[PDB]
Ligand binder design. Sequence first.
Ligand SMILES: C[N+](C)(C)[C@@H](Cc1cnc[nH]1)C(=O)O
Ligand SMILES: [Cl-]
Ligand SMILES: [Cl-]
Ligand SMILES: [Cl-]
Ligand SMILES: [Cl-]
Ligand SMILES: [Cl-]
Ligand SMILES: [Cl-]
Ligand SMILES: [Cl-]
Ligand SMILES: [Cl-]
Ligand SMILES: [Mg+2]
Ligand code: NI
Length: 431
Amino acid sequence: HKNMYDHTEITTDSLLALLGSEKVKIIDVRSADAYNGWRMRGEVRGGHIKGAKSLPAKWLTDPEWLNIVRFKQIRPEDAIVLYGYTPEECEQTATRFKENGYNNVSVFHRFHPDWTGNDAFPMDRLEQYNRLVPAEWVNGLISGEEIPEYDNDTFIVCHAHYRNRDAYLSGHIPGATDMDTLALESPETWNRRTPEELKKALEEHGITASTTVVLYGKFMHPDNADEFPGSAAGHIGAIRLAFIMMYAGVEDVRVLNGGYQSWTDAGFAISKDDVPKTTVPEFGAPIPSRPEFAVDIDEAKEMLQSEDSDLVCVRSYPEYIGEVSGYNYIKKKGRIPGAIFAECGSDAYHMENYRNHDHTTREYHEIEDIWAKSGIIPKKHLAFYCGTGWRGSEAWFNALLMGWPRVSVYDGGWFEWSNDPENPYETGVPK
Ligand SMILES: C[N+](C)(C)[C@@H](Cc1cnc[nH]1)C(=O)O
Ligand SMILES: [Cl-]
Ligand SMILES: [Cl-]
Ligand SMILES: [Cl-]
Ligand SMILES: [Cl-]
Ligand SMILES: [Cl-]
Ligand SMILES: [Cl-]
Ligand SMILES: [Cl-]
Ligand SMILES: [Cl-]
Ligand SMILES: [Mg+2]
Ligand code: NI
């Protein structure tokens, strides 16, 4: 007897006995930030039930909801167990599953505070989740409110963009200032600038080594027909700048999960003031403080020959096989020989395979499992790269969030590699 609106409750004892069953899918309908580890209700242990998948209830309004569920390999023959902070949060999702051919759907009522409140119930979390902050956390930061995972007294919220101040002026987080990606990267090499330039740029934007920097960008639908599609991939540029700042030596860098979209989806107020910058005289630390984060072409070539290391190609498949260069300013087409392929998504200005539809980072278990299928594992020294280092930065940031101990970005990427005609390259569908 199937009931569309009254859902069977599964008990704690029943759920414990089902932990590790291959026919059970445990589904966490809270926000992705709570899933990652943020203790959004003040619970003592944050994260998700061990083995649970993430399906935020907010996605019920996505017309591709069923395609998401199927992409996550959640099948009708599976027993589905939903949980949230409350059982009431799961009722609409439970009904939606039943409306789409899923007949075995249950709701677990005792995740919080029963499961979160007992040491014997297993939970998982993203090891460095506090670097990927929710919109509620940023709102508390700028409001002077008491927030977890913050012990500083100096902060700056930074809106990233590529030569497009309209992305900032058309709507930004209150109090935030804008940072053009050209402030930290050079248009001649599309690599990070020299230490002396980075020191001046950071100071002029009001950033010291001991300043908590919160970075975000605005997605504005990049179109390859425009001259600068990167001006619309604002949140990749935010993560690009987060990489450069962490390389330079800013001790505490956070990224707003999902960028501007998360701020408006949370319903917070937005400002259009052109906030003047409050400069600081001294960055206060040698640049770079974390040089291991950045890999150049000589070290990258050594990594291609080392048993201990690997380059990770975070480009699209058309770029990989040499159909296109991916950019209107690169004529050479092909791939670096010996790199491990980890497809970014559709083109150079999208990161579909590393993101959800709302631009938050994809469930990290899925990324880790895909990576491990290709030999991309934390025991190696990995240098993520792409065209110019933007997409490689976002992949690098994801591995950083998992706590991987030796991950870097090969800054030069295909742009630098193909600019030397003596560098070997492959083309065509791999054989
Ligand atoms: C280095 N710029 C900003 C010129 C790149 C950045 C980039 C975006 N997606 C891949 N690379 C661009 O916009 O083509
Ligand atoms: Cl399971
Ligand atoms: Cl953390
Ligand atoms: Cl919070
Ligand atoms: Cl443009
Ligand atoms: Cl634009
Ligand atoms: Cl983006
Ligand atoms: Cl490549
Ligand atoms: Cl690392
Ligand atoms: Mg570069
Ligand atoms: Ni190798």
